[model samples]
Target chain A: STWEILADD
Target chain B: MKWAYKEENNFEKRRAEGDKIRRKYPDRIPVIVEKAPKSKLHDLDKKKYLVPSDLTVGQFYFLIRKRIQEDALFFFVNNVIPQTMTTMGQLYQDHHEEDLFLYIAYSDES
Candidate 1:
């Protein structure tokens, strides 16, 4: 989800 | 136009740079991220980024947060906050400057 705010390497 | 890149680079240089980037990385969007002049947040180690078109703005925000090791921050595009759900492609199409670069400024405040 957008709220998760995880950065993709 | 007073952002760091805008200040340090002339339009012609930035335009050429953007063109080269797009030509080389067809799937990525050219992005420039910087700390707002008045922000208390530390400046980013690098101001230029090639973000994946499919990446969400929320994920981009997290990328910056991790870079600075900060817990809270805000992003402003054209002096306005962008929706976290917005995709990089959508935002770049809507907000990229004449140079074909999407410039973003960050702050510690809302």
Candidate 2:
């Protein structure tokens, strides 16, 4: 997805 | 006109740079953007973004601005503005799994 929330990289 | 254009570089240099990257990765690289918690760039507040690796930090900044309907940006780190010539590939790469490192954005006013 182009947008996202902070999470595991 | 009040300004003029200049040619300070050639295709040779630009092509070489791109070719070097192509040798490393055949497809686009990945980039992640972390928006400042206090920023009003929508769900971007403290969020991560998945973007193309070829984008310049400056171009990325504008892309964010355009999406959030913002016109100005203060993403710089206290005087270090993202130069147009700066590429996203050079800035962030700590991430694994095709993801790029990211930073928190600052500056958004209504």
Candidate 3:
């Protein structure tokens, strides 16, 4: 999902 | 693969980037001429009195040479080297040695 990268960081 | 890299980014920053661009002109260049001084014309019994030549050829040649050298040196020093942040007038005002050198060089050449 689009939010996955920022959420993981 | 070498995968890691350090990155620093500025999105909105005011930058002052200064440089001189020397572009050669392919067309007619601008020319500047100095204004002549006011002089009185005398008539001697309707025959104009001949004025004595105050300046000799050598003197005139020396003057021209000095002017050319001063201009050349000033351009080289100020513009090319950026030795001192001086205006053209300031450069002339501060450098009498340069002026004398210019005069001597021209005198020697002639």
Candidate 4:
């Protein structure tokens, strides 16, 4: 949940 | 000017510092941790650290978040989020800069 990686590039 | 380690220090010096740290602690990964400009959390006590090679990125992030008493935070290495399960040693191997340090930046938001 919190540890998940989030990126749009 | 306020800038990251990569921009603050010249290449040769940064590399030399990285090489020395690695040679001194071959079993640990040298990390340059900093707060992103937009971050609201206070800066870390220090920027450089020698983290255990076996430590996971997720664990380390939790460690810092707890240290700062923050509920939510984001960690980035090499300008991108790394897999939480990846060990510090593994991340260092793939992402360490020419200076031999894994540059990490954290923010309060995504």
Off by over 4 Å in 4: A1-9, B1-8
Model 4, B1-110: lDDT tens per residue? Answer: 14466676898978887777778777788777788877788877557667788888998887677666624688877678888999988999999877677778888777
Question: What CAPRI class is candidate 1?
Answer: incorrect
**Listed models, DockQ each:** 0.05, 0.21, 0.01, 0.03
Second chain only: TM-score per model? 0.93, 0.46, 0.17, 0.85
Best by TM-score: 1
Candidates' lDDT values, in order?
0.81, 0.45, 0.19, 0.74
**Could you give candidate 2's per-residue lDDT for residues B1-110 as a string of tens digits?**
11010032244643454355446544344333444456555544323454455666666666666656524556643225556666665555432222123443445542
TM-score of chain A, model number 3? 0.07
lDDT of 1 by residue, B1-110 (tens): 36777888899989998788879877888888888888778887577888889999998887777788624689899879999999998999999999989989888888
Q: State every prediction's TM-score relative to the real structure.
A: 0.87, 0.45, 0.16, 0.80
Residue A7 lDDT (model 2): 19
lDDT of 3 by residue, B1-110 (tens): 11011012121210110010002211111111111112121111211011112322233333333433322221122223223333322332233221111001111110
Candidate 3 chain B minimal-lDDT segment of 10 residues: B13-22
2 or 4: which has the higher DockQ? Answer: 2
Instruction: Point out the worst 10-residue segment of candidate 2 chain B by lDDT.
Output: B1-10
Clashes within 3 Å, all models in order: 0, 1, 0, 0
